[PDB]
Design a protein around this nucleic acid. Sequence first.
DNA 1: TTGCTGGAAAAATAG
DNA 2: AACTATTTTTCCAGC
Length: 225
Amino acid sequence: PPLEWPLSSQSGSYELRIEVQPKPHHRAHYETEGSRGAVKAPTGGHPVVQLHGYMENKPLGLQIFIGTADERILKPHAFYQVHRITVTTTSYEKIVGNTKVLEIPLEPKNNMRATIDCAGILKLRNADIELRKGETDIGRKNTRVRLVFRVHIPESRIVSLQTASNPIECSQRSAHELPMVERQDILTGQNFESKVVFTEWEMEATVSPVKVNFYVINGKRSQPQ
DNA sequence: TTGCTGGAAAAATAG
DNA sequence: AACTATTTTTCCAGC
């Protein structure tokens, strides 16, 4: 079942859930550089993923890849690949289509719970990707990703679950300069002479049914909401 | 050695 | 063909 297919995070009594979410900022590294580390959690630990409602005593693979955080439907990000780090967990890398995918064991003895400390992020160069035949996606200014996890549970048929993380900003500059919105309804985020502006219409909100968006502004705007 | 950075200069590029 | 403010890629330095 291709990565480009959408899947539920649950089916029947099975549910794949992100227990601890990644930080909102992880600076990716290039091939012309050293590793810039595993994706960290705000704890100072690491993302945690759990599968619920698996009763059997045989372990499963958890697959990890880097997807989009865009308005369109979710897909492998053309310009970022997961990076194996070699760390508590054993892991290995396979290719699936044009996409690199990392696989971690998910074990009954740990309640199908895993700490993700062995996945960093590699930034590919826009020029290189945009040349590949069949590719029309645009790198420039597309530096937000999500960790995507999927799992394959066999019966007698295969139930295939996917959960994607909150967006991560992988750009050094955007992390220094931009406000980032994590949660709403009280706004929490990062790098908050701040203003908040609603549009459709344009109207500053005062502060430290219809379809309509807001943005937090510094300069240097967050994404629309 | 490699891993893992922070910080920033060089290079690229959109319009 | 050339420019410039903005964005990406390489580079330096320090454990």
